[PDB]
Amino acid sequence: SYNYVVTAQKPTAVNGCVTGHFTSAEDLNLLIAKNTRLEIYVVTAEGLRPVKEVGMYGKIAVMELFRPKGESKDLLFILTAKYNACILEYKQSGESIDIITRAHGNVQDRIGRPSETGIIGIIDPECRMIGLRLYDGLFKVIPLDRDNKELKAFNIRLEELHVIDVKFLYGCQAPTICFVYQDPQGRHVKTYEVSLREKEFNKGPWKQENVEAEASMVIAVPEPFGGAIIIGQESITYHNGDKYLAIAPPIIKQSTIVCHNRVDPNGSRYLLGDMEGRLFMLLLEKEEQMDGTVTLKDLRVELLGETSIAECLTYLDNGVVFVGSRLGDSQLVKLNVDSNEQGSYVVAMETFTNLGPIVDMCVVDLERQGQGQLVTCSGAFKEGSLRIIRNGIGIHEHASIDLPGIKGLWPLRSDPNRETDDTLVLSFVGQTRVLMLNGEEVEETELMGFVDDQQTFFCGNVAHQQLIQITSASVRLVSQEPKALVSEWKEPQAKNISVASCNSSQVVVAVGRALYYLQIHPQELRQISHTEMEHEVACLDITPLGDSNGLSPLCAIGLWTDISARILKLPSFELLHKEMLGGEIIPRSILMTTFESSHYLLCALGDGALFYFGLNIETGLLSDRKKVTLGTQPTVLRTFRSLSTTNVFACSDRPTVIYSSNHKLVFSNVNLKEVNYMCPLNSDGYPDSLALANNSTLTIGTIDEIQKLHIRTVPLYESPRKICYQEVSQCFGVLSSRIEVQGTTALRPSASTQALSSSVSSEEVEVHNLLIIDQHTFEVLHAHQFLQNEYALSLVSCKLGKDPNTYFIVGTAMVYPEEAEPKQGRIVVFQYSDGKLQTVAEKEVKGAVYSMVEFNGKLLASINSTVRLYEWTTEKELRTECNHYNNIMALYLKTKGDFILVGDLMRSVLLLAYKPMEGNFEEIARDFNPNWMSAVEILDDDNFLGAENAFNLFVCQKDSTDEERQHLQEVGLFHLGEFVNVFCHGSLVMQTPTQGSVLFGTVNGMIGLVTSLSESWYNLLLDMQNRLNKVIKSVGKIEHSFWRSFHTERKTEPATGFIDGDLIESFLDISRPKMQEVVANLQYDMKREATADDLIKVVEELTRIH
Ligand SMILES: COc1ccc(-c2nc([C@H]3CCNC3)no2)cc1
């Protein structure tokens, strides 16, 4: 098996968050862990400024900042889920930012079952040690000597086997842990000192205490309080020596508090977040003492308001809180001293997309044909949603004029008072036209000073309240009031101008090979200098960059013949830098531009190639050449603003926006047909807009947010579970569940209680529903509620037998507390007609209906340990045809032709065939290796894909004996690092090295793709990986091969049959010399030594598949 796996959407769920001074001594930073990704921000009064985002070869399990004695700057400790430990430092060497690994090592033990309650990692306030709870009964200590670069550790026996939480205390002479543990006698809090000298615990400073039965979190309180707060379900207690204070506030009893964060450095106030998204303030009241110590007088809890359900909370000063969510969108909120109308102190400032968990999804061509969109069931509880995801950036067209032959567009302010454009100047072969803008009206008009009988190459507002028009014949300077020609420049023999560039006070024009530099003065075009280039000029730019006061010391130029992009000094025209771009196709557009504070040269060729380089605006040096391909026609580049950010629109057959993300250039398709020319337009009637032209038409519209994927959110206010599309009804079916309390009563309104119409089947509880949702408005048209204690598990939309209706079919389970698994459930066939669901037929079965699939006009269903095929009879009932029994728990089905792939709870996958001339199933083959499955997919007749609970993928094949024949072989293995809930065939790209397309959705909201490769392609890419791994410096010095090794509690093996597309794609981001190392000696097709250029082309083809 040869497979390739790549990220289409990175994990969005927030697994943890910390604050401190990491980037510099005086920066306040927010660090966010999104599984495999670490995001670093500087906190401002403006908000969060992104400075650096890195990938780890690992799932981040522990992330803590700490400050070694007498240092100005925090270091970062990370532990991965595979027990990779590192200490990281942030270093900025001028422009370049580097994460350096100061220490690393793997801290796994040989014997050890991972603690069921997870990895805990803590660091003592005096930075003497890191403490890790990895396994029950052991506490691992890493001394923080500067010498301990390998992070060598020792284990201490911990008598208490079941630790709930642990922290290091402040204000202690020896490092001291405080922890809650559980035994038969209940829950207790205890302390121990940790002796480095003895490598053992010593007696803690205070005696143990019994605590609440559901005590779950330990907070170490800084000086001057010291001590610990213990949070439980109905109590909050403070402990410190012969000091004990407890409160039992009813207000917290409704929902478990699951996260905390310190507001005040001295511990006077904490935030607390619960499972329903309530946000509390915990206040510690001080009492003075004669000896000048400070003790705790009392504790209070106050309800502040509501946030997203928080996985973590981080106070960012000035009343600002970052709410990191796993189950909904993350937020920035503000806390105010005074409450609002409805009584909340919490006001939301910003919302960040989280797709996670993705519990189901499907692919549908909603709008066009051939343009797939992903529709997910996302989130949980009050955060549950549908998310609709599609590639590319949209334009909202607001005007359309038929007007062929446009050769350029320029906006103009004809009134020197008003700030908005009021004029659009259009060029045509040998002619110019001026459109005036009065509101939404676009009237043809003249404009005194400008000529209409020459083609315009540039026109604009310029210095000293003047306008400029540059044509093939001359440069014309025009006064604003009144409009009159005040100056006109011509070449000495009045030869044609061939190329024009202009800013507010400078002009460079070309005449064949000649260049002329003019300055714009009051009533004067002043000729400053001229030169003769070695070849004919193709293109020019003099865009001023940086702190430049609108003046460029640089001229960028592209030439014929040598195909060079050059940087020249003005006024002398001295050559500062030359780059030969190769080939025999001339540069067509060149642009100096700034993205996220870094300066670049862009240069586009007529064949669709785009080169880009770092530009030093001081020396004129170009560096770090990169090349993408943006189409096959000449590309024309032009800056525009939207949402207070400068970007570049690339006009071609493939219109593109160029922008920056994490200080790397990014290229995103615009969803339009061919655009030939554009300009920004910001007029009264068309504010913050774009004017667009093709061969026949002028358009004016606004642009969506600049990003790779557009996401629409449909709030449900309850948990979505499964989704299916029903084309004939133009709706989705969505299974959903809401929580109600002890009959039962609801916590808030939600999709299933707010449908247009409703039907019903004739502690906290789940109430399950089938929602019918309109595909255009996403309005809830109908909700059908299932029986009390009925859980809806599976859903399909299909036709059966000879019946022409399409039905929604739901499989359920009746859930009773004492049952190990369900012994009762239903299959229900519904028809959606006239705005309601009618129940057409039912069938009681003796188990949970985990999975259903349409199979050759029949209904395949898995019921507990049985796989069953039903026929749909002429009297509209389901009738069993055949059964398969050899499963533990058949959770997952997929089919292809007569083949059925079965995913088991614990015995991996199994391949059935229906035998149409015997009316029964045959077991073809089974994977005899145990695996705890989460999802399955058929890649093709011979290849079966599985995902399992320890975040691995594998691929099974038949072994091309007869006892031998029924053994599936695991021929592919890969540690993905995500939990796959759903696989589905399809693509987000409009319909090569790869064949097939399978998308997957995950708990962290990551979306991935799996596709197939030939042996040949695999071998090349495998070889590339090995070379890439030798040159790339990895954060924490984790080996890529270690990261991607298949890993469960049973077995660890190198990955095989799987290319890591994220790694391959990173090839485009290394330095050109590194690309040479990577390239040196490797075959490529009959055969030859491959070049860096060859590989850039290949990797580009591979980015196109998502
Ligand atoms: C195992 O524990 C440790 C603790 C601290 C360091 C360390 N401190 C530093 C300082 C000096 C220059 N940069 C910050 N660089 O590494 C290394 C390993």
Side-chain angles (χ1 to χ4, degrees), residues 217-241 243-252 254-296 298-340 343-353:
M217 290 182 316
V218 170
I219 301 170
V221 180
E223 287 173 343
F225 298 106
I229 294 161
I230 307 296
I231 312 279
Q233 277 178 44
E234 43 184 302
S235 66
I236 299 168
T237 64
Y238 174 82
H239 301 269
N240 194 355
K243 211 328 174 211
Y244 171 138
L245 202 322
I247 59 164
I251 198 180
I252 66 163
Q254 307 203 314
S255 182
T256 302
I257 294 171
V258 290
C259 62
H260 64 83
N261 175 249
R262 194 176 56 236
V263 171
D264 296 319
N266 70 7
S268 298
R269 291 184 294 174
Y270 286 83
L271 296 167
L272 307 174
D274 80 9
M275 293 179 77
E276 296 195 304
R278 295 172 193 104
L279 183 75
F280 298 90
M281 194 70 88
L282 173 67
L283 297 92
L284 282 67
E285 203 205 323
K286 308 186 208 318
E287 159 163 48
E288 299 190 282
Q289 302 289 167
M290 281 298 289
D291 66 6
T293 62
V294 170
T295 57
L296 180 73
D298 205 3
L299 288 168
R300 287 184 294 118
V301 186
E302 276 170 43
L303 182 58
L304 294 179
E306 183 179 78
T307 69
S308 309
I309 298 168
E311 182 63 6
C312 60
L313 297 163
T314 74
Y315 184 77
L316 302 176
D317 294 355
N318 300 300
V320 180
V321 178
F322 177 74
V323 185
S325 185
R326 278 191 296 118
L327 295 182
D329 292 332
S330 287
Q331 303 162 302
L332 283 171
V333 305
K334 173 133 190 165
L335 308 181
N336 299 118
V337 282
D338 294 285
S339 68
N340 72 359
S344 174
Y345 301 74
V346 174
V347 174
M349 300 162 49
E350 201 169 357
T351 294
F352 305 100
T353 302

Side-chain angles (χ1 to χ4, degrees), residues 66 68 71 75 87 89 102-103 143-145 148 151:
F66 74 100
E71 225 73 10
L75 298 184
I87 300 174
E89 176 186 8
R102 289 293 182 195
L144 283 167
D145 294 62
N148 191 17
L151 300 185

Side-chain angles (χ1 to χ4, degrees), residues 174-184:
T176 302
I177 55 163
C178 170
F179 63 101
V180 166
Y181 68 102
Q182 187 162 288
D183 65 15

